[PDB]
Amino acid sequence: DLWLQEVSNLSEWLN
Amino acid sequence: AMGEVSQWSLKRYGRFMLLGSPTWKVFESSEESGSLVLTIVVSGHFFISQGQTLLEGFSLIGSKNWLKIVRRMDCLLFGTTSRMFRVQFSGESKEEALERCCGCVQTLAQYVTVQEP
């Protein structure tokens, strides 16, 4: 749940 | 630069802090602080270091039981059961950073599955 949430939030670092 | 170790330089390392109240502590490669380096030892140990300070260290052996990794482009998210941290590889270009990440994934993958989102 938190894992899945932070997998998506890893976009914070992406271009 | 041994045959004993593989090393990659990181742009940044983020420690998830919830497992005031910050969510992340973010470390970068500095000329004063030290270079951020991800080290995998042939024996199966994983480290992240900034200069001399070890920010992360554990065995990848039998880590299939308690370690998840996911790659997105030049970033990795690591989850241990609980602790979580993310990493971005460095390079002059988007391509060189991805090349670095991929070479690291190639070593990690001998011990654990590196998943896509």
Numbering used by the authors:
A (entry chain B): 560 to 574
B (entry chain A): 13 to 31, 47 to 108, 113 to 148
Could you give the paper's own sentences about this structure?
DSBs are induced by the catalytic activity of the TOPOVIL complex formed by SPO11 and TOPOVIBL. To ensure genomic integrity, DNA cleavage activity is tightly regulated, and several accessory factors (REC114, MEI4, IHO1, and MEI1) are needed for DSB formation in mice. Here, we show that REC114 is a direct partner of TOPOVIBL, and identify their conserved interacting domains by structural analysis.
The structure of the TOPOVIBL-bound REC114 PH domain (two perpendicular antiparallel β-sheets followed by a C-terminal helix) was essentially the same as in its unbound form. In the N-terminal part of the TOPOVIBL peptide, L561, W562 and V566 pack against a hydrophobic surface of REC114. Specifically, W562 is located in a hydrophobic pocket formed by aliphatic side chains of K95, V97, L104 and M115 of REC114.
